[PDB]
Amino acid sequence: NVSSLKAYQIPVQSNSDNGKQVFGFPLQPGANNVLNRTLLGEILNYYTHWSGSIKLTFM
Amino acid sequence: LSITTPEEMIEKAKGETAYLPCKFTLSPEDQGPLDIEWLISPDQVIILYSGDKIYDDYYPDLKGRVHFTSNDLKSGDASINVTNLQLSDIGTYQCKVKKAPGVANKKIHLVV
Amino acid sequence: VEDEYTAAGYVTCWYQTNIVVPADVQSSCDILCFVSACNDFSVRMLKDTPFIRQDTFY
Amino acid sequence: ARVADTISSRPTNSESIPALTAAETGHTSQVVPSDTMQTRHVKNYHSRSESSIENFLCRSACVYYATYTNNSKKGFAEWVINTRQVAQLRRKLELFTYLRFDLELTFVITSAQQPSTASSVDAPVQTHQIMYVPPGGPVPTKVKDYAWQTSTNPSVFWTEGNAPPRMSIPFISIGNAYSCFYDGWTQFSRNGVYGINTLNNMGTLYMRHVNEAGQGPIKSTVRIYFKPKHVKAWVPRPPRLCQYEKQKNVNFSPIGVTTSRTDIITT
Amino acid sequence: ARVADTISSRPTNSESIPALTAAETGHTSQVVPSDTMQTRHVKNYHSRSESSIENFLCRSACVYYATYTNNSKKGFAEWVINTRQVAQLRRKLELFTYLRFDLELTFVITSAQQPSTASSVDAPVQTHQIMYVPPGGPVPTKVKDYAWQTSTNPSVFWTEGNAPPRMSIPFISIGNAYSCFYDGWTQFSRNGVYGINTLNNMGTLYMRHVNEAGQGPIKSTVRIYFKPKHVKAWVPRPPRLCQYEKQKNVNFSPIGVTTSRTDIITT
Amino acid sequence: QVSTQKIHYTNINYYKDAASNSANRQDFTQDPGKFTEPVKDIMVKTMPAL
Amino acid sequence: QVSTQKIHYTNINYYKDAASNSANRQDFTQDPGKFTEPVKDIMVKTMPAL
Amino acid sequence: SDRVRSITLGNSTITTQECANVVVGYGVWPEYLKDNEATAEDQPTQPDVATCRFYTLESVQWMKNSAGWWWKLPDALSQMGLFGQNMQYHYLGRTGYTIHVQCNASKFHQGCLLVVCVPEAEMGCSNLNNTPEFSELSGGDSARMFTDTQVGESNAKKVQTAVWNAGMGVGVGNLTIFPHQWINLRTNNSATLVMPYINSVPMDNMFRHNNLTLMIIPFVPLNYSEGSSPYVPITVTIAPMCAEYNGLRLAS
Amino acid sequence: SDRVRSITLGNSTITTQECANVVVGYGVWPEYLKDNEATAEDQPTQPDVATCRFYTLESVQWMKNSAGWWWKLPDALSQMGLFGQNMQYHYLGRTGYTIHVQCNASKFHQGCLLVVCVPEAEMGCSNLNNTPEFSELSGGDSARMFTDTQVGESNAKKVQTAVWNAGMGVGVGNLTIFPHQWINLRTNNSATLVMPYINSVPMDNMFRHNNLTLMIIPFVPLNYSEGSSPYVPITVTIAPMCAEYNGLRLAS
């Protein structure tokens, strides 16, 4: 899905069993390869230290 | 760059499979390309890892008997599995890792 | 950069209940996810990026 | 310019929900971490100083380097001034659409001896001349010419073994800001090249030796360094992802969004 | 900051004994020589100025020196910045546990000619470039590369025959003080190396020539000099007795407390 | 002429141009409201959005 | 700006940072009481310790 | 008088008939984290009765040919009740200790101990290129002991336990610059120290970093004639003061 | 508006878009133990951030032939983090709960639940002379389920799970006198109750006495046509409010 628009979608289906996982990733906003090329991640890859909190808007 | 134990002694028996570990961590300055060697002195290279592709036909006595173990070599795994140990496998093995600007060694003494 | 001393944990997401759905509706709904900084974000120690290489002049 | 602090909170249970919102309206949410949990009153002493524009852009970077041989005909270097040729600086400029800055040009000139044939060579210290031509002026063709000296174009004379030379250039443009991008042609019939503007022309730079060929050829090399100051930026822009290929246009080859992982839950 | 004086005394005979005490309570005694004998009132004019911290540490010392050949491939010197490699400076730092200082880096660069083969060699003045890379930036591999110039890392350009170059570096750390010692691992499973911290990383230093190989190889040599200023120290520590052996760990070989004498009463 | 640093320091302009001065490095102002909330009707945190 | 030496001398800060100043060399204060007597109950010289 | 003390904390109480004065840190008392110094973004938890009590470690026998012992301080309390359970579920945490060590003999034994509390005690390995492992560096509530002989080179990962170098390559005579007290069987019976939080960061993880070390070294060895009691035990009691935590997670 | 709520506690937050009003106890809010009512002689401990958060139990599938479920309330939280560890080392303890149960279906399913919180729910055994054992009366975070058929006499120690008698020999229609709410898939989605400490003594042990019981009984069964989603789960979340303890001891 990397060379497509499918990389932004999380598939959520009507599951049969309960308590399953949807996704997951570590929170390293300059080191992980999911938060790397975002708009926040291409500002942090000009600096070295960072601080503060992060919002994660879902929809 | 730093290896966990830069020298030890490993004692195994003939016909078994040796497990020579080589693990490391990553200091924040290390940003270059990866490089992993292995040596023997019963100074001949026995395996390589550079440019994401493995080259492993180097020692004639150990032809097709040594392999890497993990699938995640850029996470701190450089262990090799020596299959079918013989009496003539006596010598110090040297795990040379070089991710710039770091370099480390590990002299593994293997006696069966 | 990827360090082990100052790692920041993990973010997961779990089903609480199922996704129920009426008749003649598709099942596989999709979810988007954004990211942003708060009002108290800050940076330091300007360096050069690792994302753009070069080998000649254009 | 300190950052905002954080105020403590109590366990609430009421109708005012700060967490649920709607991102349909194009409004990025302005929540605080004091709304979804219990926090303590933290005195906050960080600073947003190094994230400003005048600390992000006012740093020197190489733009070009050309070599020229003393023992040659037409041995001299011409270079039209533009930012588009290096890539570590160009990506920093295309974050914003309209820029406005002056400039502090600085040159680092080094020399090297070529494999000459003559015996017991010895040369005194050399002299370089860096001529700056505004767009439209008469330009020289050969090195031994009278258009180099007899001109009122602002040049700089430098000899080796000293501090590097430095001149400053103010905001020379016809509009109100340099245009990093120009969607639309330059001819009214809409034919020809696509993104060529006449709003950020600054001129050329002509560099040459001043001495003559004594006994052995000397091949020099000169780097040019920008330094934008007093910078004001406008209308930000998402950063360039694919590799550059040309200096004039913006063309590219397609590539994926990021490097992949094995599975959607793999950490 | 004068020292305390001494007041005269009279021959006493009473119950208040100032000399007998008990060292069990961890309290070093605070007696004066005016309590065990008869002294005179001595005006005392000495000074404790040179025993302060900012007169004990703010002195320049060499940290490293590397050589690099002009006529070579990968001829350049990389060095991660750390105090642990020399021994005359390292012992001065481990007197205290937590330090906090800025830094004044100074380089002394010398050159020497290698035994070349070419005839009638002559080179102009050389140029050196000392690039400073913060921890995480892209580093160069070969000397002829575009990552040297086109970067916003703070480098310094120097030519020979002048004053030595000097740049200043503020307190770059994540904690509140540099940790000279770190008892405990860096991985939460408690495996691997022992005393490796990520609290005093300052970056690397890349040094290379700027000129090209004219006719004869030149082998240079560059020393690096620290100078801590504005220093604040915390939690003192007994001085290191046994010899150092490695730069990362603190390992050693055992040796006695001091050199011996012949008999307990021999003076 | 004399101002504070990041104690004081003294800065004198020498040349009689405007492009000859040093960089300011102390223009500390920001206003993120023209990027986060570029809407017409104002929006409160506590109330629901619709 | 002007202070005494070890007569007076004049010191001007030029750069607009804080890590650019010269070394102080005149922070003359000491307090050895936190190393010699780090105890809770106070201890007099003349009286016996126990 | 001036010889008796009675320190109480929580639901425990340590009393001593014969003891010297108490020595407190570098001159400060362990208080809570002020709001100017904090960096975490959530609210801490303070149990304050469930942790602040005197836990008691194991005892060691003081023989005639003894060498010394050491404990790593936020590791011996890993299994001791509600302190050991709040240390696992959280992520951060600061503490201040109140160390107390007691060893009684009659008016006929002679000897002298040195009780010191060393911050950031890095120890040296046997081989010069390796580093000591976790199982040979500390023990859960069990004292690791020094030796009087240099450890041989054939060991791979073992701590250098030469007592005159105190494990850290430093002269053992200069160890009194740290906060310390002396146990002397002639006039003293119990030593007591109060140690504030000493670290370069305002809060820290507790499973990866042991930021204190209580060392006990006998300078004058134990000696007596025949007919006296031969078994002399030492027993240390530690109580955390003003502890707090942050960052809930799963167990580990 | 009047449909959305957002209750937060500690480091968790439960939000609901469609829910009715909250029902609170018998008219009181769970506060701390006042000094007039106390009887213990020591000082209590109040973690207050380490316990007061929303733990989440297991989920159950609402089939068409379902009967009902029940949980014993200070027993399902025996393994849930710092509440389950402070419950073992102490001896006493009072709590107040904030029960929340959520079950979502579309605009095409029909059905109705009854969510009630019964204090002192003694249940009846299968045989008339025996008493039910512990393993068949409650489960750690697992719902025990009713039946629609009378349990046979051949069992020795099993709970009578006839749903029209609600296990306690009482008419199930009269169960609404306790604090309760209705889940109705037509107009409602989530039910929420706040239960204060209801006991005849001011504090109690927590391993021997389960002083609450959350029952869930579907009156109108789930029904839909073919083509809708057949799997409808229910999930309950409970958070203790204003808890405190006394009497340290060993583990058990």
Curated annotation (Swiss-Prot), chain B:
Any coiled-coil regions, as ranges: none
Domain spans labelled Ig-like C2-type: 1-109
Modification note: N-glycosylated.
Tissue-specificity statement: Expressed in pancreas, brain, heart, small intestine, testis, prostate and at a lower level in liver and lung. Isoform 5 is ubiquitously expressed. Isoform 3 is expressed in heart, lung and pancreas. In skeletal muscle, isoform 1 is found at the neuromuscular junction and isoform 2 is found in blood vessels. In cardiac muscle, isoform 1 and isoform 2 are found at intercalated disks. In heart expressed in subendothelial layers of the vessel wall but not in the luminal endothelial surface. Expression is elevated in hearts with dilated cardiomyopathy.
Disulfide-bond pairs as recorded: 22-95
Domain of life of the source: Eukaryota
Positions bearing carbohydrate: 81
Subunit-level organization: Monomer. May form homodimer. Interacts with LNX, MAGI1, DLG4, PRKCABP, TJP1 and CTNNB1. Interacts with MPDZ; recruits MPDZ to intercellular contact sites. Interacts with JAML (homodimeric form). Secreted isoform 3, isoform 4 and isoform 5 can interact with the extracellular domain of the receptor.
Record text about domains: The Ig-like C2-type 1 domain mediates homodimerization and interaction with JAML. The PDZ-binding motif mediates interaction with MPDZ and MAGI1.
Role: Component of the epithelial apical junction complex that may function as a homophilic cell adhesion molecule and is essential for tight junction integrity. Also involved in transepithelial migration of leukocytes through adhesive interactions with JAML a transmembrane protein of the plasma membrane of leukocytes. The interaction between both receptors also mediates the activation of gamma-delta T-cells, a subpopulation of T-cells residing in epithelia and involved in tissue homeostasis and repair.
Protein name per UniProt: Coxsackievirus and adenovirus receptor
Organism in which the protein naturally occurs: Homo sapiens
From-to range in the entire protein, with total length: 20 to 137 of 365
